[PDB]
Amino acid sequence: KTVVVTTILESPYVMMKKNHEMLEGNERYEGYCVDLAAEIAKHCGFKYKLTIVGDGKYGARDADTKIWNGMVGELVYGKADIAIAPLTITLVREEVIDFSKPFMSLGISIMIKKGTPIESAEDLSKQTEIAYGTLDSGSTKEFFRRSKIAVFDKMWTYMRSAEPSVFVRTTAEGVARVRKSKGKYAYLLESTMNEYIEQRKPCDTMKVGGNLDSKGYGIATPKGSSLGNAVNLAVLKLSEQGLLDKLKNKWWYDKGEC
Amino acid sequence: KTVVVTTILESPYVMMKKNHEMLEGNERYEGYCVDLAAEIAKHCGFKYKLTIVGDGKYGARDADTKIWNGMVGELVYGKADIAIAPLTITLVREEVIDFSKPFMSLGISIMIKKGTPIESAEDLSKQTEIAYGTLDSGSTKEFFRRSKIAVFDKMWTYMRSAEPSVFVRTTAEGVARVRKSKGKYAYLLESTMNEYIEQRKPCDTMKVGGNLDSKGYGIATPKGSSLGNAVNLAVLKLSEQGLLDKLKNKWWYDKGEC
Numbered sequence A, B: 001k002t003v004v005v006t007t008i009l010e011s012p013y014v015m016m017k018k019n020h021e022m023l024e025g026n027e028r029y030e031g032y033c034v035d036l037a038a039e040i041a042k043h044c045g046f047k048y049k050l051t052i053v054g055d056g057k058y059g060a061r062d063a064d065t066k067i068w069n070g071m072v073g074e075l076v077y078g079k080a081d082i083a084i085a086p087l088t089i090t091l092v093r094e095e096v097i098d099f100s101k102p103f104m105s106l107g108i109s110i111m112i113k114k115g116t117p118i119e120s121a122e123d124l125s126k127q128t129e130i131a132y133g134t135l136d137s138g139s140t141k142e143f144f145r146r147s148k149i150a151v152f153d154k155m156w157t158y159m160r161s162a163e164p165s166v167f168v169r170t171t172a173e174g175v176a177r178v179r180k181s182k183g184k185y186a187y188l189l190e191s192t193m194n195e196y197i198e199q200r201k202p203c204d205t206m207k208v209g210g211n212l213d214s215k216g217y218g219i220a221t222p223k224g225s226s227l228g229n230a231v232n233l234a235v236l237k238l239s240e241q242g243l244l245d246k247l248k249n250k251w252w253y254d255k256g257e258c
């Protein structure tokens, strides 16, 4: 049986090839997670089909309906066999899906327009002239929503009631807001995405400060699935052989435009 | 039933208190892993006894008999219920024991005596005046034994046949060897330990270069043990609540001497 792989259009994990229109199936896409999916499938010995998550989200549980959206939803409701994406390992997710050991490290970080008078979270929290927000329906939003650290609770208290909304529906949208806001909008996003954008034209953004936390992305499967074991062993093998490091260099730095 | 916890004396994860010989049971010890064990046991609701691993090793498989030693061996052969220690998650171990998601990140790194003319692993591999080695029966030695990377493979070739031996039986031994060899010995060890030592008197060593790889420590349990599920969830909870970052600050940096 062909394994259905849910993923998400997010640079440089999964992007449309410049000629995707004249290609078919898996060949339409390129990126870090496309390269990783191929290796995983090869070492686990399965055929697969890449599919982009329909609502374009990572996955959160609606407080009202209790329904999971995003890639997590696709796994929970049986629409996909595996997720290969920059999907953060979290407790609430681990409760309904299985994750491999992490294939990539990251932390919440701050993206500013170059020259913006900000050095850290504490700095953002102490002021009001510069707006700031996070992706919607992602692990970053939940981190702020749940935090008990004073600086972070204060940041959440501002963000949840700021108007107009400080939250964006896509990473691309957050970056665009930073670029067009003349230094008046800072964007809280994962260090991996932050680092990738830092190396792309127009070269007008930068990551500042340390990471606010430390965690990892994992390959996700439906709870109890028979795939989980093999996939986890494959990720460990690829980690030790240095493939993950090679892939990061290929898609983040070898490509650098700044 | 009281959970038997295997662990290892390795600063600052598990250390003997100065109060010591006059204390009993778990009270005799302090450190990051002593504190971790306490929070894990609280969240999973078990009582536990800390026991130092008999042979003082992390764990590797004798290539001849295929018998496991160290903390890995204690789990594999039913002598301990759980290992709470700076135990590296690796492919060969995952085949015989279960690991939680990582509670701490690290990479292999180089420790030198201050002033030693060495900037990197490449530097080390290009010369012979400075000897270098790793801990026995650990994941670092295995990393080099298995590595296909040109620098590391060449390093292994030198290490595996150098005389007198460049390998050491404990981390303490590795560090003291560096400190007393007048710059003629470099020690390859995990960045967490290296960074800890760099901040302790006599303040004569230094971590140089980036990490050679990226990985993590996990809490380990016997294959299929029922404890594993609860333990893993406890670690994710502790991660998200910030307790892990708190612990590291307490034991690495709050304690700094240099």
Ligand SMILES: NS(=O)(=O)c1cc2c(cc1C(F)(F)F)NCNS2(=O)=O
Pocket (backbone or CB within 6 Å): A101, A102, A103, A104, A105, A106, A215, A216, A235, A236, A239, A244, B088, B089, B090, B101, B102, B104, B105, B106, B214, B215, B216, B217
């Ligand atoms: N340092 S980490 O927590 O992000 C990590 C952990 C493990 C990996 C790989 C990574 C990293 F590449 F993301 F850096 N490999 C498999 N075993 S692991 O210890 O969980």
Ligand SMILES: NS(=O)(=O)c1cc2c(cc1C(F)(F)F)NCNS2(=O)=O
Pocket (backbone or CB within 6 Å): A088, A089, A090, A102, A104, A105, A106, A214, A215, A216, A217, B101, B102, B103, B104, B105, B106, B215, B216, B235, B236, B239, B240, B244
């Ligand atoms: N970056 S990491 O690979 O070492 C890591 C991963 C996860 C953690 C914590 C860490 C770190 F603190 F060691 F940094 N928390 C639980 N989930 S995780 O993604 O596996």
Ligand SMILES: N[C@@H](CCC(=O)O)C(=O)O
Pocket (backbone or CB within 6 Å): A058, A059, A086, A087, A088, A135, A137, A138, A139, A140, A141, A188, A189, A190
């Ligand atoms: N990687 C995150 C999405 C990005 C973010 O929340 O900043 C997740 O899995 O939800």
Ligand SMILES: N[C@@H](CCC(=O)O)C(=O)O
Pocket (backbone or CB within 6 Å): B058, B059, B086, B087, B088, B089, B135, B137, B138, B139, B140, B141, B188, B189, B190
């Ligand atoms: N953390 C290592 C021990 C120290 C080392 O190998 O450098 C292990 O679990 O084997």
Ligand SMILES: [Zn+2]
Pocket (backbone or CB within 6 Å): B241
């Ligand atoms: Zn708690």
Ligand SMILES: [Zn+2]
Pocket (backbone or CB within 6 Å): B062, B063, B064, B065
């Ligand atoms: Zn033997």
